Design a protein around this ligand. Sequence first.
Ligand code: HEM
Ligand code: HEM
Lengths: 368, 368
Amino acid sequence: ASPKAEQRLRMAAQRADATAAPQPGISGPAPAFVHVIALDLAEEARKNPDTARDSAAAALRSWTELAARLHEESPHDIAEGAASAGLLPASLMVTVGIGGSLLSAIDAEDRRPDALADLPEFSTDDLHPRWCGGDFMLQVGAEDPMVLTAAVEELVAAAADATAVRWSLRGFRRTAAAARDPDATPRNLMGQIDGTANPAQDHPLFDRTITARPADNPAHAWMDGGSYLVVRRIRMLLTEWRKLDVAARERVIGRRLDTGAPLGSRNETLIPENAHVRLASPENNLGARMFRRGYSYDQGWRDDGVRDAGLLFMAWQGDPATGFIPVQRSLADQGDALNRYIRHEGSALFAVPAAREGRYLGQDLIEG
Amino acid sequence: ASPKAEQRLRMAAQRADATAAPQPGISGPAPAFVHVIALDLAEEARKNPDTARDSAAAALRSWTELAARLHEESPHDIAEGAASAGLLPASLMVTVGIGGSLLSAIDAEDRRPDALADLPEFSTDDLHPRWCGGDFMLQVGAEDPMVLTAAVEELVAAAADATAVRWSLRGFRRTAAAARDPDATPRNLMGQIDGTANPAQDHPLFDRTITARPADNPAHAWMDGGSYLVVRRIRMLLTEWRKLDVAARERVIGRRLDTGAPLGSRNETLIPENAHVRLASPENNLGARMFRRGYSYDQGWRDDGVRDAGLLFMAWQGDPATGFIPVQRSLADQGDALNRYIRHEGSALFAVPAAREGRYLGQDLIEG
Ligand code: HEM
Ligand code: HEM
């Protein structure tokens, strides 16, 4: 035994905080596994605003109610014969989001806040249309992949009649069980420390960065206190990346691989003109800031021997126009050193509304 | 702290047994994650026996030597900037196998033992050709997915010039960190306890089941004391499976979901005529026996909304003709109750030779 050992087990052992706002899956410790699932209203229902809106109401209610249960109970408490029987709670958490395309389907474009405007095209884009967008999102996280997939099955089933999967991707980070130091910042498939410059969660900057400011227009206020998720599936050119020596890799980002220190320094907590962290800095983007909570993905190999692995990148912010968008535009247009080694292949924006007492998620938007 | 807690951490904390025979990745405790990678000799080299055989020698030597290092060191000890830096050893283990197609490429059909004859077609087959076969195999296992993918990168890179990935699949089981009882038999995506009837590893039946008996012909003796791996990618029809009530599910297999006891009993440690365990029993197959060491897989959803998830099934045996083959033939032809809910979509047979002092894996076969 040891303190560190107890600490290595905590993420697997504990339930998540079901009260975190706007919803679970943003603040608090990040579980090791994630499944991001984009869904559309079922084809037939989607054809007409009225059936579209009924199916959305059903989907969103079922999910809300099941996310409630899954935060206090495990999948195997909810149903007999689940894959997760005999397992600890593993920080299971569920987040539900709404795409701008949902508003189109239900004829509610009047309800679309400016912050939910489609993402612009970026000059480095290499997006696959089937990996873009979606009427809804489920983000499901857990510290154990079996607990994860059991919860996914129940959540997809709860809205099976009303929705269809559009795209999905599983991701991972180091397990707390295998971290020499389970409080250390996790690394990505490029070997880099990933997360250092996020605003600290015990600091007012966190909530300010994440939280949608009140809407001027009551038709847009269903997103007050919510957050916006930009998800990007970013393939890493690892074979080419591995040809670089360590110094060169460090120059691409502007931080060292060993410690995560900016270049020329000793601690995590000179920089090339085209370095990622220089071009991405709020400083270089009129104060644009986001909270990044991304996962690695490993999908083996594709045609013609291309490595299908990467960063399932996820940025949270109050308004994409003062977060992800200006920053990505700087990285795209100003020639981030990193562009060479990455390809943006999937993209989506989801509005993630604040949970409210006595109402299902997005009930305001649906109404009733 | 507690004994169970220390036990939950052990798989992440320890190195694997590098001395287990024929190779690592068969006996001992099974790590939570696996990556099964089938590779072919590179296209140009493969065209002619002489360059084929040179590239095979290179591939097999590099892999052997790197598997050696990876059993005593972690990927981040082998190279700077690895994705696994700062992580515990996580039971990393590497297994190398050889397909019968390799023997064709190197013009060594004389060397093909009878046990390495291609698997027959089965009546329930639904195999995708790109997911079948392969000249080589790498099986890489670890308790942490980040440790896993770091080791994979180094192993694929070590033979990059000489080989190309043909197909691959990642799988998982419950993590030891999240098991209420980390010694309990792991479950599958159908909720079932999976592994009960395997021969016990502290029992002579284990080695007898696994181990290739000596070859009559010295040209075939390179597999003496080795083992044969049948891998099948088996998709589960989970949506249809979940329509059944618990009793009905239990009738398909012949064991209970809660405890894994045969039907009508209390302990893991009446049965329908078409029950899986009845038709699969050595009893129903002239004593045919295998060691099953499979993993779940979750690949999200495919066209047209089909759930791409399943069992990455792996059977080890001394000779497929007295193991996997007769048993699968009984399940296929005698109408296993389970057939309804599964589809065999990928298949391969690999010869996994015994490690020998002072020689690389399969050096006998290559010679020199
Ligand atoms: C595969 C793609 C990417 C990789 C590998 C990557 C990697 C990194 C690394 C290693 C850091 C430094 C450590 C840290 O502060 O977290 C970092 C920082 C950052 N990244 Fe990325 N990143 C990627 C894509 C993006 C994208 C698409 C955006 C935004 C559009 C973004 C925005 C940022 C920001 C804002 C910082 C912090 C800069 C600062 O204030 O110092 N990154 N990234
Ligand atoms: C998705 C496919 C499959 C599933 C879900 C499945 C599931 C199970 C389960 C739950 C058991 C009982 C627990 C145990 O003893 O391990 C079992 C036993 C067994 N399975 Fe499978 N199985 C599958 C495919 C296969 C295949 C393809 C083979 C061989 C060709 C096979 C051979 C066996 C054998 C030999 C036993 C032990 C029977 C005994 O002696 O009692 N299984 N399987």
